[model samples]
Target chain A: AVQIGFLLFPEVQQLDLTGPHDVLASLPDVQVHLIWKEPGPVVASSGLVLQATTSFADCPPLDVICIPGGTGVGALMEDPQALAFIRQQAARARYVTSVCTGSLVLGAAGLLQGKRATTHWAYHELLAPLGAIPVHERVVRDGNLLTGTGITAGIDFALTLAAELFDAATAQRVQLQLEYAPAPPFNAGSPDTAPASVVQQARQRAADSLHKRREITLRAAARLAA
Target chain B: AVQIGFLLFPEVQQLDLTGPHDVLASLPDVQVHLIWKEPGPVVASSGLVLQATTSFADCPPLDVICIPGGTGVGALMEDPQALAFIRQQAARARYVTSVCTGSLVLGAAGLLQGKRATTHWAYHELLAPLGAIPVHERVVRDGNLLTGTGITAGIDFALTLAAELFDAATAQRVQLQLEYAPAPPFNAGSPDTAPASVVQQARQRAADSLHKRREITLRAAARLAA
Candidate 1:
């Protein structure tokens, strides 16, 4: 059976973890696990509480290890215990991956060095400072590492990963099961498609959170430099 | 401020709730709450644990009330306590909504009688017995009642609801913020597009669950008659 795990933490964006989870869990004979620092309830940034099933100490080696981005990921950049766990898992896992700001987590662990990656459009530039060549795309693959940009890109990333694990036909079947056909009511899914005013407003909305993330990213960068 | 509540129940599909929760929570001044019979933790069908913040008794009047679908929804169809809570909220909320099989719960609440709606395609036919005109669409809106088809359709449903509550422009910004631009890696999102073999396999997989649901649904239907 294929074993997979997603890192869970407080203030996780929720969708970043659940979207990919919904797709990945649809595979046959696959076991998915949510791991965190401890086994308990963790509240998302959206105030959605997700329970952590396994503690870092109790986690088994997984075929695929994923990190999901959210406000909590900023704090994780400076957490050695979590970073060490990610590094350890990435070394042994057949695939190391992230969604949205989760690429930042991989960066903090020194795993993205000189690798092409992607993250939330708002945090795209920060990837370079962490030694990842930030690619502006829905999904990026560098060697065995895969990264998805922004929150909703997780669905696309998971489908892509599904194909890699098995075949396109299998992924398509999973897509059918979940009815993955998407029709956004609006065309404002990216900065390019969204109005300039809307982009400005979004930037303003994310300003404070992005500021804190930058600070932590720099600190993590410094540690990597040492 | 907009107050939105999603009914959280055990064995609920996590994505059915989290997908919509992510989009709705992004709106300004919109507070989202996960409610259940009591304040506690609920595990999704996939074993994902979600915390319920409010009990039915403690829930405030909501601007919008949403129910997400999963295997657990079958049991909820027969749960008077849950049905009463939904009916009470639906009577007062500006909009009554559901995703996936959640529409079935609304039917049990006696809200879908003679209404146009939709649900997971597999369960679409069952809606008529509940007095709902099962529309084959991703998002269905009939007066103040709204529903989405299948699990992943929650994203589209929430975005549509966001547009209705606010404006298309505001919803567009939320879409951009979440990067809702989708590029599904397959064409098999519906029975119409999926291969015959895959569909058969899917039906086989869901056989037992659907049988149980049908039994519970008939009981719930009988109770509604009484």
Candidate 2:
């Protein structure tokens, strides 16, 4: 059986974790684990409560280790226990992956050095500071390191990994089962596609979080360099 | 503050709840609640545990009440408490909504009689048995009742409701923040779009659950007819 584990932390972008998780869990004979410091409830950034099924100390070696990003990821980047857990797991896991700003956590763990990766568009520039070559795409792969851009991109990233883990047919079958054909009511999902006014408003709304994330990224980068 | 409540039950499809929750939670001054019989962990069909924040007895009147479907919904069809909760909430909600097979639950609660609705393609025909006029669309709105097709369509469903709750600009802003743009790696999300072989395999895989759901739906339909 393939074992997949996701790092569950306080204030995680729940979708970043749930999207990939819902897809990956559909795989045959696969067991998914939500791991945190302890087995308990973790409040997501969206104010939803997600339960952690396994503590980091009790988690088995995973075939895939995924980190999902959100406002809480900033605190995680500075958590030595979480970083150490990820580093240790990635060393033995078949695949190391992340969604949204989760790549920053992987970078904080010194796993993304010189790897081609992607993250949320708002923080795309921060990837370079952490020694990652930022790829402006929905999903990026550099060998065993896989990254998905932004919150919704986790679905695409999981499907890609699903194919890699099993086969194209399996991935396609899962896609059909989930009816993943997406139809956004508006073309405002990306900076390039959104209206100029909408983009400006979105950026403004995210300013506080962006500022905090930048400060955290630079500190994590400096720690890596040191 | 707009209070949006989602029915959280055991074996619920996690994405069905999370997708719409993520989008709707982005709305300004909105509180999203996962309501169940009690406030506690409810294990989803994907084996993910989601916490129910409000008990059925404690839930405040909601502006929007949503039901998300999964394998667990079959049992909920026969659950009187769950049905009563939905019926009471729907009577007062400004918008009554569902995603995937969730519309069937609304139908079971006697909320969709002759209403135009949509659900998972595989089970769309069953909606008519429960007195709903089945519409084949990604998102369908009939009066104040809104329904989305299949699992992933919840994202689109939520965005549509978001626009109605606020304005096009507000929904567009949320869209950009979540990067709502979707790029499926394969065109296998629908039977119409997928390769015939993939479609056949997917149906075969879902055979057991489909068979059981059909049985449960028929019983609920019979009860409603009586």
Candidate 3:
């Protein structure tokens, strides 16, 4: 049986984890685990509370490890505990993965140096300063490390990883089961597709969070350098 | 503030609720709540544990009420407490909605009578026996009730409803934030697009839970008739 785990924490975007989770968990004989520093309930940025089943110290060896992203990740980039946990897991896990700004966490853990990765569009450029070659695509796989872009890209990321881990045929079956056919009513889902005004509005809305994240990322980078 | 609530239960397909929770919670001034029979921790079908904050009795008046589906929803059809709470909220909610087979729970509550709705493709036909006019579409809105097709459709479902609740521009901004540009790796997301063998395999995989759902639905329908 392949054991898979997602690092769960307060303020993380629930979908960043749940999207890939639903797809990966569907694979036959796959075991999924949600791990936190300590076991208990953790509330997401969106107000949803999910419980962590295992603690960092108690988690078993994993075939795959995922770091999900959200505003909460700003603090995690500067957290020794979180960085330590990711570093330890990625050292031996068959695959090291991240979704949204989660790739930023991987970078903070010093796992992305000289690696090609992708993160939420807002954070894509931020990767280079941390030593990762930023790929603008939705999914970027470098060696045993895989990263997905933004929030909803998690579905695409998971399906892609599923095909690699198993087979295209198996992944296709999972896609059909989840009815992954998507029809967005609007074409403003990406920066290139969105109107200039809408894109500006989005960036303005994210400004505060991004400002805080930059500060924390720089500090963490300095620590890594030391 | 617009208050949105998702009815959470043990063994729920976690994506059914989390997908929309992520989209709706992104709305400006909108607060999302997960309500259940009692407050505490509940395990989803995927073995993901989520915490329910408000109990049926403690929940406030909500602008939106969402019912998400999984094998767990089968028992809810005959659960008076669950059904009664849904009916009460539907009476005053600005929009009543569901994802996947969750519409069946709405139908079982007698809310879908003479209303056009949709559900997971596998159980779309099942809605009629419970009095819902099932539509074969991604998202179906009848009156103030909106129903989305199976699992991943929850993202589309919430974005569509977000437009109705607020405005198109606001919803578009939320979509951009989620980076909802979907590029499904395969075209087998629907029965019409999937190969016959894949569909057959999917049905076979879902057989046990679906068989149990059918039996429970029959018993609930008998109760409704009485």
Candidate 4:
């Protein structure tokens, strides 16, 4: 059985991870493992907690590794043990994927170097500091590494990954399971359609996430420079 | 702040619970909590594990209580502590909901009396012994009690609950975030659309889930008869 390991940490943005998890878990072909640094429950940013299947010390070699981001990014970027584990394991992963701010975690590990990457719009600029060209897209891919922009991007991210791993049909089938046909009742899903006021509010809210990334980037940059 | 509690255990189905959880956590005004009988992470039937935010001992009064099911149903059914807690906590909940065969947990708790309920279609009949009038609808509501059919039904379940608690437009807006309009490439989504061969194949694969539910249901029946 092919093992798909999802690196879980405190304050993980559930949607970013779970959105794709829903699709990947439903594919009926792969074994998905939710792993954290420890062998207990991992909490999300929203205070929702989950049972962890394995710890870094004992996990199987992973075919696919997904890193999803939330407020956890703030603390995780500094977690030496966690980052070290990811850096070692991710090298062996055939496919490394991340959603929303999770790409930042990949960057924090110095893995995004010279890669095309994307993250929540708020953190787009920080990618350049990590030797990445941050693209503006729902899902961005460079080689075997894939990244998604923002929270809801997990659906598209997972589907694209599914399309890559298996086929478009299987990915489409997941979209179908999720009823991938979207019917937005309003025009606020994207910055373009959202009212200027709504966009401003979102941008303001995103500022905190940006600030967090900047702090991490500065420290990480210093470490590399040293 | 609204509290949403989830029943978690080993061999639990992760997608069935988290699928809906992803949709529910998007509510900015709501606080979501994952509760299990004990501490640590609860393993999914798929073997993925997530941390439980609280144990039954730590559960606060809930505005909403949710339970999702999988192989643990048999063990959980016999867990008097699990049953006692769900029954007592649900008594004070503003809305009690369940997805998949998780309805079995409620049945074992004796929470289904005279309520119109539903579970995964494959296990609908199990509620018969629990004093619930099972409905085949994807989502079934009896008074303030709501139950959904199966794993995939969580999306609709959360949406419907959101609609009931908030407003239709608000719920629809979340649908937009989830990209809830589904466009399946194949009709094999439901039992009807699944080909005879596929259904049989799925049945063969699903036999474990089926048998487990049967065993859980039979054990729960003793309480029902009482």
Best by DockQ: 2
Estimate, for each residue in B1-226, the C-alpha lDDT of model 2 and write its tens digit.
9999999999999898898898888889999899998998889988788888889999999999989988888899999999999999888899998988888899888888989888887878788889988888878889889888767777887888788888999989998888777888888888898889998898787788888888998899888988
Candidate 2, superposed: residue stretches over 4 Å from native: none
Model 3 per-residue lDDT tens digits across residues A123-214: 67679878888788878889899887767777887777788889887888898888778888889888999888889999998888888878
Best by lDDT: 2
- Cα lDDT, all candidates: 0.86, 0.88, 0.86, 0.72
lDDT of 1 at B131: 76
Give the distance in Å from residue B220's predicted Cα in candidate 2 to where it truly belongs.
1.9
Off by over 4 Å in 4: A18-43, A48-61, A75-92, A108-116, A125-136, A149-200, A218-226, B19-33, B36-41, B48-60, B77-81, B108-115, B125-136, B149-188, B193-196, B215-226
How good is the docking of model 4, as DockQ?
A: 0.17
Error of 2 at A5 (Å): 1.0
**lDDT (tens digit, per residue) of candidate 3 on B50-81:** 88888999899999999998878888898899
Clashing pairs in 2: none
Across residues A1-226, which tens digit of lDDT does each residue of candidate 2 receive? 9999999999999998898899999899899999998998889988898889899889999999999988888899899999999999999888998988899899889998989998888888888899988888888888888888757777887888889889999999999888878888898888998899999998898889888988998999989989
* TM-scores for the candidates: 0.96, 0.96, 0.95, 0.74
Candidate 1 global CA lDDT score: 0.86
Off by over 4 Å in 1: none
- Two-way lDDT contest, 1 vs 4, winner: 1
